[PDB]
Structures are given as C-alpha cells and as structure tokens.
Design a protein around this ligand. Structure first.
Ligand SMILES: [Mg+2]
Ligand SMILES: [Mg+2]
Ligand SMILES: [Mg+2]
Ligand SMILES: [Mg+2]
Ligand SMILES: [Mg+2]
Ligand SMILES: [Mg+2]
Ligand SMILES: [Mg+2]
Ligand SMILES: [Mg+2]
Ligand SMILES: [Mg+2]
Ligand SMILES: [Mg+2]
Ligand SMILES: [Mg+2]
Ligand SMILES: [Mg+2]
Ligand SMILES: [Mg+2]
Ligand SMILES: [Mg+2]
Ligand SMILES: [Mg+2]
Ligand SMILES: [Mg+2]
Ligand SMILES: [Mg+2]
Ligand SMILES: [Mg+2]
Ligand SMILES: [Mg+2]
Ligand SMILES: [Mg+2]
Ligand SMILES: [Mg+2]
Ligand SMILES: [Mg+2]
Ligand SMILES: [Mg+2]
Ligand SMILES: [Mg+2]
Ligand SMILES: [Mg+2]
Ligand SMILES: [Mg+2]
Ligand SMILES: [Mg+2]
Ligand SMILES: [Mg+2]
Ligand SMILES: [Mg+2]
Ligand SMILES: [Mg+2]
Ligand SMILES: [Mg+2]
Ligand SMILES: [Mg+2]
Ligand SMILES: [Mg+2]
Ligand SMILES: [Mg+2]
Ligand SMILES: [Mg+2]
Ligand SMILES: [Mg+2]
Ligand SMILES: [Mg+2]
Ligand SMILES: [Mg+2]
Ligand SMILES: [Mg+2]
Ligand SMILES: [Mg+2]
Ligand SMILES: [Mg+2]
Ligand SMILES: [Mg+2]
Ligand SMILES: [Mg+2]
Ligand SMILES: [Mg+2]
Ligand SMILES: [Mg+2]
Ligand SMILES: [Mg+2]
Ligand SMILES: [Mg+2]
Ligand SMILES: [Mg+2]
Ligand SMILES: [Mg+2]
Ligand SMILES: [Mg+2]
Ligand SMILES: [Mg+2]
Ligand SMILES: [Mg+2]
Ligand SMILES: [Mg+2]
Ligand SMILES: [Mg+2]
Ligand SMILES: [Mg+2]
Ligand SMILES: [Mg+2]
Ligand SMILES: [Mg+2]
Ligand SMILES: [Mg+2]
Ligand SMILES: [Mg+2]
Ligand SMILES: [Mg+2]
Ligand SMILES: [Mg+2]
Ligand SMILES: [Mg+2]
Ligand SMILES: [Mg+2]
Ligand SMILES: [Mg+2]
Ligand SMILES: [Mg+2]
Ligand SMILES: [Mg+2]
Lengths: 48, 185, 172, 159, 58
RNA sequence: GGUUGCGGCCAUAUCUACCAGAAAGCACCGUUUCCCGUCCGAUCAACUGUAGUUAAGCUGGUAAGAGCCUGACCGAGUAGUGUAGUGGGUGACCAUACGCGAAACUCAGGUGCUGCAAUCU
RNA sequence: GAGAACAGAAAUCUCCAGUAGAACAAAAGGGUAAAAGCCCCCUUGAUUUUGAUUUUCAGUGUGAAUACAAACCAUGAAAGU
RNA sequence: GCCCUGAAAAUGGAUGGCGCUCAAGCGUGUUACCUAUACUCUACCGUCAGGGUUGAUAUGAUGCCCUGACGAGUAGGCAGG
RNA sequence: AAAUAUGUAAGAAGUCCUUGUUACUUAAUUGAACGUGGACAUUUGAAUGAAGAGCUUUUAGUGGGCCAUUUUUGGUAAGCAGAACUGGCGAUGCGGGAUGAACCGAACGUAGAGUUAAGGUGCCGGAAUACACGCUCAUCAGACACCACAAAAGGUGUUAG
RNA sequence: GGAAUACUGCCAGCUGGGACUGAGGACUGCGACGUAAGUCAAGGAUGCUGGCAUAAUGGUUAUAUGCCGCCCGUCUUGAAA
RNA sequence: GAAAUUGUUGAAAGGGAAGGGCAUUUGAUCAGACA
C-alpha cells in the first residue's frame, strides 16, 4: 500500500552521463543494465 | 514515449444527458442532477440515468406488472416509480390502490389506476414528495421482449429465428432445417 | 576492463541440514569494482567445483592493498589466453610498483600484442620475482644493470598556441 | 497430399512406456470418480475404445458425468481468441485423479487447524503463503575451516 | 503466378487485442449430455424435496 | 516366523549355477464305475485320501554371478539451452554477461514390500 | 539346438530353449501372449429408435469416431462383452 | 599478432571527401566534450477523465470553477466545423 | 532425456456437522445427485498490476504482403523459393549508420530551459590535433556492426609466446 | 607504536558565478520567526531607475546568408524513379 | 471585363534550372499602442 501509493518516479537523464559508452550491455560488462547494487545511488542521484 | 496499457482518449460510453430534445425532459433532468449531487441518496442517482435512456431501454411497464410488484411481501403501500411510460392491461381484473409516478401514463392506464382510487404522480411531484426517494419501488419493463432481439445471434444450432419477410412453408424450411433435406441447422 | 583493484573474495556452498559449515574457498581477483569481482569469482568457481551462485553464497569481499606501494618490483606473470584458433599458456615479466599496476598493463599488453580482449584472458598467478637473476625476460633484465642512466633524445614540447615564432628545438 | 487423420502424429505419444506393456493393472479400474472431481488426461494406447484425441493429452479437466465404463470430462479449449467448452467421453483407462488440488486441500484442512488452535489460545495467526524471502544475516566461522585459495588452471590437452 | 501459402504471422497479435477471453464460469452449469437414467430420476428426486419444502410453510 | 486361498504395487519379485528346508499346507502321487475330453485318462473330467514321496514344484540361502532397483559436489556446473551486445572471426564458427541444466561414465548400497481370510511346533 | 526308415538344404514325428525376433486383408506407425495372434464351439449387435459428444470447424456441412438412453437379441457357468 | 606475397576487367573515382604514418591507422584503457520530434521542469492548445456549482436581485446550465493523465498514423469509422 | 514453450490448482460458487427427497442405485435409508437446519470472516488463505469490470448490436476497410535476429526445408547458390516464434517496414516522421523502406537510438500537439541515446569530437562539422600502454611502414597500407567480399598456401619483415 | 592522506559514502553545513521562466489575481491552506506587537523567502514577481513615444519595438514583404528541402497524383512488398 | 498569356514603366535577383522550410541582416511598407 505504501509503495503503490507513490506514482512511479519520473527521473531526468543522468547529469554526469552514463559512465560507459554503450548502455545496453550488463553493468558487469561495462554497460548500464542489470543489478549494479549500491552503485544505483550514484546514478539515481544524477537523475534526480 | 509511453507503452500505453490501455486505449487513449476513450469516451466513457455512458449517456450523460438524454439524447432527447424535449424541454420538459430536459427540466426533469435539471431537477435530478441537482437532487443527485446534493442528497447522497441512491434513488436520485438511478433515476437520473434512466432519464437519459433511449426508447428501447425504456420498455413500457404495464399496469398488471405494477399490481404484481405490489404483491411483494411488505410492498403494498410503496409508491412505484417507472421512468418511462405506463400501459394498460385488460387481463387483470382487480387493480389495487397505490400511487404510480412515471413519465407517461397511457389513457387507459391512467383510467384503471384512478378508477381504483390510486393516484398518478409525475416524477417532479414524486420528488417534492420523497426527495430521497423514501418508500419508492422502482420498476423496469422487459427489454429483451423486443422483436429485434429474436434475430440476434443468428447461426447454426443457435435456434434463433431468421430475418425473413414473407413466411409460411417454402420459406426457409427445407435444406438445413430438416434431416430429410440435406441436414438440420 | 578498467583501472583495477585487487580483491579477496570468499564464498561457500549454501549450507544444508546434513552439511552445515561447507568448505570455504578464496580467490584473489583483479577487477574494477566489487560487482565485477564477485561475478568473476563465481565465473571461476563453477570452473573448478560443483557450485553456482544460485546455490552458493559470498562470505567476504575485501580489497587487498599493495604492501609497499612505492617499491619498484619485478613481477613475473602467468596467464592463460584464447587466440582466434586455439587456447594458450603464457609467461611475461612486468616491472612496476604494485600488482594492480602490473595487471593494468598486462591486460593492455595482451590486447595489443595478441589482440586478446579482457574476456579471453585468465590470470594464473601474479608473483613478485624475489631475487634478480630469476628474472628471465630480457626486456626487463635490461633495467637491472648497475649505475643505469639513459638520455631521452629528441624532446617534443606541446605547444599551447596554434602559432609559434621560434622554430622549435628538440634539445634536451 | 498432406495427412491429418485422428491419431496422426501420435507415434510416441500414445506409445506405451519402456517395459510397461500389456494388461493395465487392476487399480486403474478400482478407482472411483464423482462429478466435480478434477482429472488429468493421458491416453493409454493399449485401449483403443474411449480414447481422448491427441489434443486433450496432458490436459486437466472436471468430471461432468459418470457412466458404466467412462467419465465425461469437460475441458476449455481455446479456439481463436477465446475458449469454448468441450466435453470428452473418456474410458477410465485414460483418466487419473489430479493432485493439482491436494496441496490446496492439505493447506485448508491445516489452515482450519492452526486457525482454531490460535483463536482458542489468543489470536495471532498468519496463514497466507509467502514467497521465498531473502536470507538473513549470519556469521560463518573459520574454526576448522580456513579458506582454501584456488586459482584458475593452465590450458592442457589430454587426448 | 504463385503467391504466399500460409502463415500464422501476426495472428496472435490480433488474438490479443480483444482478448483471449477467459473461459467464463457459472454456479449451476448445464446438465447437457448427462446420463438420461440419472436425469430422469433426479427430476423426481427434486420434485419431491420441493413438495417437502412447501410442506414446511403450510 | 511358515503355509494356503484371494490379492495390491508388478524384476530389490527376473535369469544362471549350487545347497538347505522342521511342522502343517501345498504338491507330486493311486484309480477309471459314474458326469466329462482326448490320436493318447499326458492335458482336461470324475473317484479314493486309501497305496507312495520331498525327487521335482514351492519356500529360503549362496555367488569379487548376469539383470534390475536406489544414491552420490563420480563424471559435470560438462553437453545442450532462454536471454544480452555496433562482442572476436574472411568464413566456419567461438568467447563473454544474467539464468536453466542433462545423458553416458565412475564409485557405493540393495535383491521383493505388503492387504484380507484360514491354518501350523 | 538335439533326436527318428526311405528322407536329401527343404516332407512328417519328438523334446529343449524362445519378450514376440511372428501373426493380426492392405501403407505405415501405434497396439496385443492363459491375447488382439492359432485351433475349435455357438452365432448375426454389420440389427431398431431418435438425441449428445470428439476430430477437421465457421466451432457449418460431410466422412469417420466416442460415451450413454429406449428396444430386441448373441454368446458365456458367469462377471460380462 | 600487425604487415607483405598469394590478389586479373572493362568512362575517371572514392575509409563520405580532404588528408593522416610515436596517426587522423590497429588492439585496449581513462576522462572530458558535441546533439534527437526521447527524458526532467514550465507555459499554451486540444482530447479523455474526476470533482464543485441553479440561491436570488444581469449577460452563455449544451454553461461556469477546480484537478489529473494523454496527443504518430495509410485503408477505414465517427465527430465538430 | 533437457532448456524454451504448455494443462490445472492457489477458497464465500469455500470447509466442517446434523439428517430430508427419488421412479436412479445398493444385500441394505446402502449410495448417487439436489437440498433444509447448524459452526468459522477478511493474513478469507501466494506475488505484481489494474485510468475499472462485464455484456449487446451493427457496420468499414482487408483478405498480392515484404523485412531483421533466432529455429528451419528445397537448392552449388541467389538481392532465390518455402515454414516457426517474436519484433519491424507496409501505415512513420525525428536523431545516427555520407547515401538507403526494414539496422542502431527513439516513436511526433505549439514552444522555453535543461539532460541524454545511438553515433561522434584534425578540417569539411557542433564537440580533446585529449590522456595512456603497446602494435603496424605496405614501389596498389589501414581505417568500425548490418555493409557493400576474399581463400588455401607461404615470408630469414617485425612482435610477443 | 601513533598519526596523516587517498578512495568511497553521508550532512534537514555554509557559500560564489551564469542561464531560462514569473502561470496565477481580494481574502481563505500548511507553516516559519519573534517574550510580544508584529514580521516572513510559507497555496506562482515585485521593488527602484532610466530611454523611446516612434517605424524605436513588432508585422508583412523582397533579397542576401547558415543549415536543410527530389514531382505530384497513382497502383505497388517497394517510386524521385 | 477574372485567368492563362502579352507590351510598357518601376523595383530587384541571377558563376550548369527555379521554386520551398527555420532564422536573422539590409531595403521597402504598415498596424496598434502612448498619452
Ligand atoms: Mg553533477
Ligand atoms: Mg555537461
Ligand atoms: Mg562536473
Ligand atoms: Mg560509440
Ligand atoms: Mg536533475
Ligand atoms: Mg411476441
Ligand atoms: Mg600485497
Ligand atoms: Mg505428410
Ligand atoms: Mg507381457
Ligand atoms: Mg471398434
Ligand atoms: Mg495464380
Ligand atoms: Mg513470389
Ligand atoms: Mg494469398
Ligand atoms: Mg510333511
Ligand atoms: Mg471311457
Ligand atoms: Mg492320471
Ligand atoms: Mg482333473
Ligand atoms: Mg530338495
Ligand atoms: Mg504352488
Ligand atoms: Mg549383480
Ligand atoms: Mg562448446
Ligand atoms: Mg544459449
Ligand atoms: Mg553476432
Ligand atoms: Mg559455453
Ligand atoms: Mg500394422
Ligand atoms: Mg486369459
Ligand atoms: Mg451394415
Ligand atoms: Mg457430416
Ligand atoms: Mg476422411
Ligand atoms: Mg580502404
Ligand atoms: Mg573522417
Ligand atoms: Mg584507439
Ligand atoms: Mg518539443
Ligand atoms: Mg491524431
Ligand atoms: Mg505459465
Ligand atoms: Mg490476488
Ligand atoms: Mg495494486
Ligand atoms: Mg480505476
Ligand atoms: Mg466488421
Ligand atoms: Mg467484413
Ligand atoms: Mg483467398
Ligand atoms: Mg470480406
Ligand atoms: Mg528488427
Ligand atoms: Mg499497400
Ligand atoms: Mg518509424
Ligand atoms: Mg538522417
Ligand atoms: Mg556506410
Ligand atoms: Mg538491440
Ligand atoms: Mg568537405
Ligand atoms: Mg568543430
Ligand atoms: Mg579535455
Ligand atoms: Mg564483426
Ligand atoms: Mg594466413
Ligand atoms: Mg610472422
Ligand atoms: Mg503574474
Ligand atoms: Mg500573472
Ligand atoms: Mg518623432
Ligand atoms: Mg505607428
Ligand atoms: Mg525612434
Ligand atoms: Mg520588390
Ligand atoms: Mg523568398
Ligand atoms: Mg541538401
Ligand atoms: Mg497507377
Ligand atoms: Mg512491380
Ligand atoms: Mg467591355
Ligand atoms: Mg523570413
């Protein structure tokens, strides 16, 4: 209930940029997708 | 862009004023959207919609169908509302008293009701008398008694009546309508 | 793959009823972050034991820092690598000041001399060549000679303006 | 021309299971079926009468009829963008009771229990199932278990 | 002039615009195709208990 | 525990060779008037339970036995596979990333469990 | 496989072994061992009534099939079929 | 591994062109920087939706006020002009 | 004997008790079906979502399709012929791949500011003649997916093994 | 032995430069600061000063310049062809 | 007394077509508003 109450957050693109030159590979291969664990905060904070 | 999960700009699909163009009906609508907006009473809300209803969703309630609903346990003193016209039914030989409120009353129906010392109210009078619709019994007539719906769903083994003009034998009663002529439906 | 850290990664075989306290295995792992490093761990562990991450657990992840980060050391490096037409075992010696530095330029070297991308390499051992004269490869022996001194001929200064009024000089 | 007869493509499907040919064991016939029973459908190729068509193989349905040597099962087959109701006259050699509801029934009978056995104590129940939760903290020891340190291996050929 | 022969291409796209409508369920389904010997008796069975329940409100 | 009649799962019950089996029971076994069947009382039918025998059946045990059953981080996280990339490669094909994961192999363990009724040192 | 006058590679007789390696009109694939195969005995259910159902499907028709109901019969000691 | 031989076609000609050789080439790393009708925020138009408001004594009740989301389009449908 | 696909179930139309109806059915008030009366509420029976769900009528256009990854048949092969699943183009502009129906990015009301994607940043051309380690000198060097080709075989050129 | 530092993270710590926007139009809400009276950056810009009062700004138009832009209609899988 | 199409006058532009989009310079032309 608590979480569905929130609309999905609408983030802008990252301000720093994506790290990486190509997004649609796994984080673990130098890309942006997948579980990147605690490194999620650096991203979101650039997007928020 | 957005992966839409549902068709955009969809109209609700419900009437919202009558399509009718009669002032009086337009006025009764005025009464009841007011009444609906300010009385949290279910009755007014149902009544308002029925007003928008087109002619086919407004089948006539007969005066015999009326008498029967009054025979419900504990219902004989209720005033019956019919958002539509009320027709007469020679087939009943003893009509009760009560008070019917409806849009139209055919001449004979009005007669029969008044003869038994009943009363015929218009919805606006029904309003002043029972703004929350207290003690009201709402009746609808039969929609699927229309002749049209006989032909709905025509198909093999549906058993549903042909769109046909002239009828009698040698009008669509041979091949495919009997085991002895090709097959059956 | 990036600029490497070196990690101890410890893991073990999800416990059971009949086998609680499973054996525990360690790897040192050269990787840019601990996310790549745990991945790598499972990558090799499923090459040696019957586990997979699904049925196993990481126990500890710790960064190993260089012992004496400002001492020049002679590293011998063992590597396994995949070429286009078959796979291969190698030994190189790299001279730098940390193992982490060393692995940075190994990876560079494999890439440049053998066209081996990071996926196709396995570090086998990285280990400090203790006593000199066990140093094998001459491109390193070279730098171990007594009283070593060499000039840097033909100096290029980087200009900052587009135009110059001099004619330069590569003296030095 | 093409061929699309009733039992077409069924070579292995109505085949008989290795070392399991012959008479059907008698329990197949001692089993009892009531309307509402959920059965699973599997053709016994040894029994040609009362056979389900291949499409209904491996399908689960509900009994709607019980006759001398058969049960009538009703399956929802989806033809088009929609399901229609299909009714199957199967002999008992092609039907078995599903366990697809055993865990539900075991769950309910048991939910009645700890529901009373809690109420009649002092409430506090919790009897919806929950998915696998992530595991919790814990402390692994070294006592008797120092970490063994593996490296990757050289390339070798053995052949 | 030969032309294409058959394809199911795009067909489940269409199937999904307006459903795959689930199968629709009812309390009291039809006795359609049920054993006539049963059904005959069952009727009288029902007629009876009906009579019994009118007999409860005499 | 044995045995018998009727069984359920249908090889851990089968197969090959050898040995052991108290008591009851099964059995083999005697007969041809009668019902009944045969080229043949071998099968099948009947009669005796009397005249005989554990030889066979049957039951059990042995065997670095054949087979079969079970297990295992034995092989193997191998083969194969769902997903990803403007990954490698002239191609053929091949690595990598998030997942799913065999079969043969090898080693160990095992060799009918059991329901109803009657009977039995 | 082993045995028996003429009799031989092949005639007819016996015994051992035999999971089907045969046979079941026909293409092939399923299936079958006190049978579904072979031999014999008795037979006409290959019949009468009108619906339901599965395949192909439009959920039309046709072909073929399935499980019942109401008859009348066949067979068998019978359960049954 | 890179490079070289293997390596022959028709108007003059194409790593897109110029040109580039410790590259402006090949492999690999690290930063920074450029910019889509996309992403975030704001205004405005329209569409859909949800609320509010007949109380007179002035001017639209198909109106007025608040709020939120959404906007590609051939064949084609409907709507308001 | 996989993976991917695939049927069903996860309750109020539920679970339990009591004991009516019948011509079916049992040796049998035995059973079968349908019930009357009674007991237990939202941790009432997994997750996530739901700009709601259900239903009815009537009618257009269409009934040449083509493409990409993967699976795949015929063919020496094809910018060839034919199937499977999805995603596309057709019907669609916008940014990138100089160019281009289908690739990559991203789907369009009128505009401001910001940030990016794919792809780029010597000059054409907005954007480092940036940083770093190697490699490579071609009297037809090479230069970025789809893509606009090259092979066996050789070199005492050079590099690392 | 005792420190420092990097690296990663946190602060409802302070603070400078720059750009775009200023919808709304009495009041009404949630707050903040004050002992208080009051004040406020708290449900959307005001304050102060200047210049022109005109072709100054703006529209239109022609031309020039940067980048971009094939011929519509059609039938087609596919047309600038 | 339209248009295609023509003469004349005036203004402008033109290195292998022309016309078009966004934007602004320059010329010409013009509305509104100030008070
Ligand atoms: Mg920042
Ligand atoms: Mg920036
Ligand atoms: Mg910065
Ligand atoms: Mg790139
Ligand atoms: Mg931001
Ligand atoms: Mg009528
Ligand atoms: Mg160290
Ligand atoms: Mg065929
Ligand atoms: Mg057998
Ligand atoms: Mg038959
Ligand atoms: Mg033709
Ligand atoms: Mg063709
Ligand atoms: Mg066609
Ligand atoms: Mg004895
Ligand atoms: Mg005789
Ligand atoms: Mg004898
Ligand atoms: Mg006998
Ligand atoms: Mg003996
Ligand atoms: Mg015996
Ligand atoms: Mg053995
Ligand atoms: Mg392989
Ligand atoms: Mg795969
Ligand atoms: Mg590829
Ligand atoms: Mg692999
Ligand atoms: Mg056959
Ligand atoms: Mg038998
Ligand atoms: Mg016949
Ligand atoms: Mg037919
Ligand atoms: Mg046919
Ligand atoms: Mg070139
Ligand atoms: Mg260039
Ligand atoms: Mg480079
Ligand atoms: Mg825009
Ligand atoms: Mg539109
Ligand atoms: Mg599923
Ligand atoms: Mg739910
Ligand atoms: Mg929800
Ligand atoms: Mg809703
Ligand atoms: Mg239509
Ligand atoms: Mg049509
Ligand atoms: Mg056609
Ligand atoms: Mg048509
Ligand atoms: Mg595609
Ligand atoms: Mg077309
Ligand atoms: Mg498009
Ligand atoms: Mg473009
Ligand atoms: Mg190109
Ligand atoms: Mg992609
Ligand atoms: Mg140029
Ligand atoms: Mg530039
Ligand atoms: Mg820079
Ligand atoms: Mg490639
Ligand atoms: Mg070569
Ligand atoms: Mg060489
Ligand atoms: Mg304002
Ligand atoms: Mg304003
Ligand atoms: Mg003036
Ligand atoms: Mg003026
Ligand atoms: Mg002026
Ligand atoms: Mg002019
Ligand atoms: Mg112009
Ligand atoms: Mg152009
Ligand atoms: Mg045409
Ligand atoms: Mg053509
Ligand atoms: Mg004139
Ligand atoms: Mg302009």
């Amino acid at each position: 209930q608590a979480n569905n109450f929130l609309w999905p957050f609408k983030l802008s693109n990252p301000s720093g940029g994506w790290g990486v030159p190509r997004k649609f590979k796994h984080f673990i291969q130098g890309g942006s997708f997948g579980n990147r664990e605690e490194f999620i905060n650096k991203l979101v904070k650039s997007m928020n | 862009g957005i992966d839409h999960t549902s068709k955009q700009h969809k109209r609700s699909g419900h009437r919202t004023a009558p399509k009718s163009d009669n002032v009086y009906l337009k006025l009764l609508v005025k009464l009841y959207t007011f009444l609906a907006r300010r009385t949290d009473a279910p009755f007014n809300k149902v009544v308002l919609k029925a007003l928008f209803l087109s002619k086919i969703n407004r089948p006539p309630v007969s005066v015999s169908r009326i008498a029967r609903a009054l025979k419900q346990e504990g219902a004989a003193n209720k005033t019956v509302v019919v958002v539509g016209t009320v027709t007469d039914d020679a087939r009943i030989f003893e009509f009760p008293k009560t008070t019917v409120a409806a849009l139209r009353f055919t001449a004979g129906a009005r007669a029969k009701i008044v003869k038994a010392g009943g009363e015929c109210i218009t919805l606006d009078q029904l309003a002043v008398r029972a703004p929350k619709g207290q003690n009201t019994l709402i009746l609808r007539g039969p929609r699927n008694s229309r002749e049209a719906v006989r032909h709905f769903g025509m198909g093999p083994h549906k058993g549903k009546a042909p769109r046909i003009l002239s009828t009698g034998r040698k009008f669509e009663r041979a091949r495919g309508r009997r085991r002895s002529k090709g097959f059956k439906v | 793959m990036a600029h490497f850290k070196e990690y101890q990664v410890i893991g073990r075989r999800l416990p059971t009823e009949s086998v609680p306290e499973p054996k525990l295995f360690r790897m040192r792992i050269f990787a840019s972050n601990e996310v790549i490093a745990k991945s790598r761990y499972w990558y090799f562990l499923q090459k040696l034991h019957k586990v997979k991450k699904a049925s196993g657990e990481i126990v500890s992840i710790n960064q190993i820092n260089e012992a004496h980060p400002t001492k020049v050391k002679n590293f011998g490096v063992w590597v396994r690598y995949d070429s286009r037409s078959g796979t291969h075992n190698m030994y190189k010696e790299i001279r730098d000041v940390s193992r982490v530095a060393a692995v940075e330029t190994l990876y560079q070297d494999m890439a440049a001399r053998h066209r081996a991308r990071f996926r196709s390499i396995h570090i086998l051992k990285v280990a400090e060549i203790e006593k000199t004269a066990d140093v094998k490869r001459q491109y390193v022996k070279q730098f171990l000679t007594k009283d070593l001194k060499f000039p840097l001929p033909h100096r290029v200064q980087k200009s900052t303006k587009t135009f110059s009024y001099k004619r330069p000089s590569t003296f030095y | 021309g093409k061929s699309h007869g009733y039992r077409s493509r069924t070579r292995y499907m109505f085949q008989r299971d290795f070392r399991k040919h012959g008479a059907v064991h008698l329990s197949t016939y001692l089993k009892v079926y009531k309307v509402g029973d959920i059965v699973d459908i599997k053709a016994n190729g040894s029994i040609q009468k009362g056979m389900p068509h291949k499409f209904y193989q491996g399908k689960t349905g509900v009994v709607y009829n019980v006759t001398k040597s058969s049960v009538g099962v009703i399956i929802n087959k989806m033809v088009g963008n929609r399901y229609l109701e299909k009714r199957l006259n199967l002999r008992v050699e092609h039907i078995k009771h599903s366990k697809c509801r055993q865990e539900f029934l075991e769950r309910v009978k048991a939910n009645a229990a700890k529901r009373a056995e809690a109420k009649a104590q002092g409430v506090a129940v919790q009897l919806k199932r929950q998915p696998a939760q992530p595991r919790e903290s814990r402390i692994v020891s070294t006592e008797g278990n120092v970490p063994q340190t593996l490296a990757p291996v050289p390339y070798e050929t053995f052949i | 002039a030969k032309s294409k022969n058959h394809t199911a291409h795009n067909q489940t796209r269409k199937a999904h615009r307006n459903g795959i409508k689930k199968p629709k369920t009812y309390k009291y389904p039809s006795l359609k195709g049920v054993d006539p010997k049963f059904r005959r008796n069952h009727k009288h069975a029902l007629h009876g208990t009906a009579k019994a329940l009118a007999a409860a409100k005499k």
